[PDB]
Amino acid sequence: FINDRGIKVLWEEAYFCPCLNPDTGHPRVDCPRCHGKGIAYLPPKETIM
Amino acid sequence: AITSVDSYLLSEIKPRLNTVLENCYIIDEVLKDFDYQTRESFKEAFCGKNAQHEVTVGFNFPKFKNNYEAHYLIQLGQGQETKNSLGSIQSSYFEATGDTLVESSTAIREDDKLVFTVSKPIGELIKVEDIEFAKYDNLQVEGNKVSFKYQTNEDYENYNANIIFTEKKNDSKGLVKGFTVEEQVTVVGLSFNVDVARCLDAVLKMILISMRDSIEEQQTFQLQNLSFGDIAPIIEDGDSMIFGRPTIIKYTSSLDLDYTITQDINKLTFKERKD
Ligand SMILES: [Zn+2]
Known part of the structure; x- marks a missing residue:
């Protein structure tokens, strides 16, 4: 049922980047893992949803 | 001379902000007290000639999407009348005068x-600049150009001077009627990263400090006061x-x-009377 009514979608999990400032607790403006957002992401997983 | 504070603020901020962000030395001077990481x-992100990311400034309620990585937002705010003169008289002028101009001009x-x-x-x-003409020099202004005696000053034939002067508009004369207005204008920096907002606020404070030497607000917008609000979430949705x-x-x-x-x-027409 789910595979039938769903749409193909890329699922990528979220995790806090190591680049977070240890003292303020807020992220670097630019880094490869996360582009200013304080949360990085894992490789995508193909999924129907 | 009606005053548009917002336009003056924008015109002062844009080139000055670009110049400040151009070089790293000034930014390091500004951000001395901040930690290594955020600095x-x-x-x-923003500093340097070749910076990929860039800040922007504009007025409020723009119909288009506005960049929220780093932006300076302006809104007009309130205003009040504080002081007046007798008959609302401010000054008297014999010749119509416009803005005050500063121009560099090499001697000829x-x-x-x-x-x-x-x-x-x-x-x-x-x-x-750096001149106090005496009677001997007989300083005279004749329209576009200003002049002084050749002989005793001949050492300075190519003096790299600069001039602060005022434009001429008409030969008519009139009275200046008006009052003083005490105006408040609100400026806020926006960023989804709080540290960027803090640094942006510091830069804003520095450029406000630097502006006090400007001709226009030295002549027009005296008595600058500042007040800061609390860091708040502008939007949560x-x-x-x-x-x-x-x-x-x-x-x-x-x-x-x-x-x-x-x-x-x-x-x-001085004439006497008889009876
Ligand atoms: Zn990161």
Whole structure:
């Protein structure tokens, strides 16, 4: 049922980047893992949803 | 001369902000007290000639999407009348005068006088840099150019001077009617990263400090006062919050209008009476 009514979608999990400032607790403006957002992401997983 | 504080703020901020962000030395001077991490991150993102990311500034309620990585937001705010003069009289002028201009002008040789050329005519000469003309030099202004005696000053034939002067508009005369207005204008920096907002606020404070030497607000917008609000989430309905710290700037300016006079006396009719 789910595979039938769903749409193909890329699922990528979220995790806090190591680049977070240890003292303020807020992220670097630019880094490869996360582009200013304080949360990085894992490789995508193909999924129907 | 009606005052548009918002436009003046924008015109002062844009080139000055670009110049400040151009070089790293000034930014390092500004961000001396901040920690290494935020300082270096902001420098990497925005500072330098070849910076990929860029800040922007504009007025409120733009119909288009506005960049929320780093932006300066302006809104007009309140205003109040604080002081008045008798009959609302501010000043009297014999010759119509516009803005006050500063121009660089290298000295030139004329058969009897050294002179400086200028872009536009002169209504009044305020100052010539590092010069105090004496009677011997017989300082004279003749429209576009100002002049002084050639012989005793001949060592300075190519003096790299600069001039502070005033434009000339008309030969008419009138009265200046107006009052003083105490105005408040609000400025806030926006960023989804709070540290970027903090650094942006510091840069804003520095450029406000630097502006006090500007001619226009030295002549028009005296008595600058500042007030800072608390860091607050501007918006919560997005995927991530917008953080900004509003700042309130105060100024005092003289709204005024020139009332011309057509009455000019040139003859007298002194006659006695008999009975
Ligand atoms: Zn990161």
